Ligand binder design. Structure first.
Ligand SMILES: C/C(=C\COP(=O)(O)OP(=O)(O)O)CO
Ligand SMILES: C/C(=C\COP(=O)(O)OP(=O)(O)O)CO
Ligand code: SF4
Ligand code: SF4
Lengths: 405, 405
């Protein structure tokens, strides 16, 4: 778009991850995995909302035993969404003990910071890779600075201490995180895990750090990169931090799949993080999921209640019509609609949309121009402007995005 | 931090804008400017929420007649927030006819696309600039692709047609927008408007485009830059788009004041855009407005309702106590609190905060280790871990951010 950083293709189930493929949205469940009903339902829900890949924790024996049945229930519904198993501390134990789960999973996640501490640490690593290789499973090697390999930090602390100009302890923590991921990645390649089976990540919780980190990742490896700002937080803060962190990197062509790590409000659904990941990619023109509305903030030049109501109804109708438009009209995901408050930027901004309307603001003739494909399509006056506009959009979508050839 | 693109300082009222100064948050009212009662109220509201400068439309005579009164009322409350006047089409008439309005304002906004169409557009431009200079008022020359100079687009469209390889119609639009701001900028300086009286913007409604644009503006001029994604839209979309548009630029050191162009929902207050502007800068470490919470998404390894509720309670308490902490504890705005769901990343991430808590996972003990200043502080057990942690948080602040000198 672009342009994309070159990487081999990693297939997570039927979903290809890589530089020649769309950046894939994924998310993670928060149901107890031992609860097959709750976990199956949420996987469905996340998949429904647009999660192309879904991760779940496989944290103990009960969780592992449920994974085949969850996978069974998804398949019985024709739901071929890929499951990634999240493993910490005991990943080698469960995968060994439970081969039906290892087989059920479509990808394993390994954290090089939660393997175990020492010389059995390598064995756990090697066991997990071996099982992936025997089954032909892809692996994510994912570092996270909340669980940084202490031995590596020490080693780089030692290294940095004797540089002619030592770097800051903070910069060294980052170095050590990158180094954890890269060295684990290179160890897996040395064991013979194919380039087409290995995804990397190395997450931190501050936007400025994360850009540093993934720039080094991209520089030092060829692997597709899983990008996210971990422990993003709640509400507006969590949404903003996630977007601000990922955007500079994505605009640089770094990132091949993303997850947004929002803390849900108790009154919020787990599908919200999917919404955010989608809006990030679409805002950067890197994906198109669903029609969008470009609207002005409204100011003293337009009637506030009228305007905000019109903008809200247009966005709700688009969302309403989307399930039908997907089936009927292929390509409708790229639809861009404008709703503007007055003649200052109304017409101009409307012409940058597929279709748009500007209301007459203060000082203006009581008319509301509608533009389509850059030129005046018609002029609305009177009551029922919202529904009139939405009829124009409906016909527009039918015409521009109709199936052809 | 950084580093900041160097610029002269432009004082908007008492608010300094420039490379040597904190990036200033601003906003814009949407009340009828002629409604003194409504508009004074909203300016206070926005200033209270943290808008350091507030813009209001001055679109007509009635609007103009109100601005001196609005300013009077703000000042009688000891509120010295700078007011920016947004002018289109008739700025020269209003500024000429209503000199007290000209004086009451703290800054004038000019749009080079809404001046008039041709050579009287220069006369309108010059009158406004001349008035600004006589009063020593700062000016923003703000271009917007929703009101792009049509003669300018034609010219560059024609010029581009004769390049050995013409650019797309889209890229030229961006070209013309830069050139509109750049040309108006050099025109105003040639008129003798001071470098310390000139701020620039050139806004588009698409992130990737906005990055290209402000990179060009930054390169071709020396002026402080007002940065924003115009017509950002509603809800999560508008929030994400604003964040993703501004972050790449701010991280590059481009941008000296920001505005977030959110379309409010009818049930949301005009202050949300200020909230978002705040979160953008604090996420990138550029400002510190208020304590923040770093929290995990939660997963199958912890109990959802408890974790999400506790995280919420922490964030609400921070918000509740800040007015008190603001007076008592200088610097508390930098406070970072972590709330984590389990032992995998809990301790690590917590040790990266000022104070944080690691909760007991689905592998259980109702007890939660608390970290402060990078090390283990204590271990809470039993019921009321939530309330006990928050008492620890209050005590932490009382000690860490205690009065000094
Ligand atoms: C579950 C977990 C961390 C946060 O979920 P995250 O998607 O923020 O990070 P990671 O899993 O490291 O990619 C364990 O590292
Ligand atoms: C009111 C207005 C535009 C939108 O408010 P904006 O702050 O999004 O854009 P601008 O004012 O052009 O910097 C007039 O261009
Ligand atoms: S389009 Fe008009 S009403 Fe909307 S923000 Fe711009 S000037 Fe104000
Ligand atoms: S800290 Fe624990 S509960 Fe939270 S997301 Fe990470 S692994 Fe899951």
């Amino acid at each position: 778009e672009g342009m994309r950083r070159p990487t081999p293709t990693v297939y997570v189930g039927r979903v290809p991850i890589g530089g020649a493929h769309p950046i894939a949205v994924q998310s993670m469940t928060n149901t107890p995995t031992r609860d097959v009903e709750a976990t199956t339902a949420q996987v469905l829900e996340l998949h429904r909302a647009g999660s192309e890949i879904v991760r779940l924790t496989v944290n103990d024996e009960e969780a592992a035993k449920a994974v085949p049945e969850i996978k069974r229930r998804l398949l019985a519904e024709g739901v071929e969404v890929p499951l990634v198993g999240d493993f910490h501390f005991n990943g080698h134990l469960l995968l060994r003990k439970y081969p039906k789960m290892a087989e059920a999973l479509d990808k394993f996640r390994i954290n090089p910071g939660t393997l175990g501490r020492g010389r059995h640490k390598d064995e756990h690593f090697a066991e997990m890779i071996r099982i992936a290789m025997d089954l032909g499973k892809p692996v994510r090697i994912g570092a996270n600075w909340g669980s940084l390999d202490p031995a590596l930090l020490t080693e780089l602390m030692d290294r940095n201490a004797s540089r002619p100009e030592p770097k800051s302890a903070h910069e060294v923590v980052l170095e050590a995180l990158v180094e954890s991921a890269v060295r684990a990645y290179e160890a897996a390649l040395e064991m013979g895990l194919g380039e087409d089976k290995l995804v990397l990540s190395a997450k931190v919780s501050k936007a400025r750090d994360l850009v540093w980190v993934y720039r080094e990742l991209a520089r030092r490896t060829q692997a597709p990169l899983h990008l996210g700002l971990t422990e993003a937080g709640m509400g507006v803060k969590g949404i903003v931090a996630s977007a601000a962190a990922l955007a500079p990197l994505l605009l640089e062509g770094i990132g091949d799949t993303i997850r947004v790590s929002l803390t849900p409000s108790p009154k919020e659904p787990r599908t919200k993080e999917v919404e955010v990941a989608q809006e990030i990619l679409q805002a950067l023109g890197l994906r198109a999921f669903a029609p969008e509305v470009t609207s002005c903030p409204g100011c003293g030049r337009t009637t506030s209640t009228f305007f905000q109501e019109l903008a809200e109804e247009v966005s709700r109708r688009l969302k309403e019509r989307l399930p039908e438009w997907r089936a009927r009209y292929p390509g409708v995901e790229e639809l861009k609609v404008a709703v503007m408050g007055c003649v200052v930027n109304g017409p101009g901004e409307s012409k940058h949309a597929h279709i748009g309307i500007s209301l007459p603001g203060a000082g203006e003739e009581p008319k509301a121009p509608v533009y389509a494909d850059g030129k005046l399509l018609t002029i609305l006056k009177g009551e029922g402007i919202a529904e009139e506009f939405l009829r124009l959009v409906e016909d527009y979508v039918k015409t521009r995005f109709a199936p052809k050839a």
